């Protein structure tokens, strides 16, 4: 499924991402845009046997288990396929585990390089929520 920005924002807000660890809601919407272009089924294979899954591109070597990545850690204790759903609940739950402090969004390269320092609030302004 491909989300519209306001639709994704409303969903992320319902799951408690607004101001989670001090990160305003725009940060999460901005990260999703640059990581998966709002596509829940987005997948990307990395140089290593790793693969990033879903709306927030969660890595299969450290966070989810796909049963193909060498030395899987699976710190979120959940199947990668579960992250490729129209329901973002699983993805958000995992992201919440990834961001343990106020600097945790650095877990997403796209966010650090293309969102941090910009007017991320622009992504949600005018949305109903």
């Amino acid at each position, epitope marked *: 499924k491909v989300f519209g920005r306001c639709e994704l924002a409303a969903a992320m807000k319902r799951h408690g991402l607004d*101001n989670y660890r001090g990160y*305003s809601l725009g940060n999460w919407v901005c990260a999703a845009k640059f990581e998966s272009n709002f596509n829940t089924q987005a997948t990307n294979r990395n140089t290593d046997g790793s693969t990033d899954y879903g709306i927030l591109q969660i890595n299969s070597r450290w966070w989810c288990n796909d049963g193909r990545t060498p030395g899987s850690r699976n710190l979120c204790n959940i199947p990668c396929s579960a992250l490729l759903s129209s329901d973002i609940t699983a993805s958000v739950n995992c992201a919440k585990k990834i961001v343990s402090d106020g600097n945790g969004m650095n877990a997403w390269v796209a966010w650090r390089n293309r969102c941090k*320092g910009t*007017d991320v*609030q622009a992504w949600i*302004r005018g949305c109903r929520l």
Partner: antibody
Amino acid sequence: QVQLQESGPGLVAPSQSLSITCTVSGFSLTGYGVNWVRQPPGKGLEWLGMIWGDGNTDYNSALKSRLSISKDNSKSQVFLKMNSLHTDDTARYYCARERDYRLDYWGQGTTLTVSS
Amino acid sequence: DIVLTQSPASLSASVGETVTITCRASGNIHNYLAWYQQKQGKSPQLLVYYTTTLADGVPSRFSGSGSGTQYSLKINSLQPEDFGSYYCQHFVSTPRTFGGGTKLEIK
């Protein structure tokens, strides 16, 4: 340690163009915005404008035509430039770091007086 | 521009008291409001952001609340170091504006 320090001329006439420098350390100007704020003697805080991590600038509506903010990431410096100086421009000027919609660190400020 | 009406202009209180400072916006600022404290001859310091979140190092006797257009900063059991000026500022788009300020002085 995050730090910001302002540097200015202290005194200027209506004929001169004001230029204030904000030197930062402890963080990268590409990851945070920097706001400029002033405070007239015995008055409150007034927002002047800002420059985002991406170089974009936004200004106070009633001062946009006289304001100009720029920066040099390599030198870790942000500049505030003003012209058409009025006596009402007398005040202490501060630069402050913006992090996700809050100004978390402020400079000590620099006092500016505008005469004839 | 969105204007912030802050009140009261001044407050006289003694140590131990509980005071409330309010800031009303001329438009919905969607919780993007912060509070600052300024001591005589010092730079403002961030106290609260996004309406209710305390900044690092700020004591829990400070609490923020609000939604829509009415916001408040409550200080429970005022302490000697709490006296000074307080300002609110909104962060919805630009330009940003500040409240007129509130002076908290001792009795």
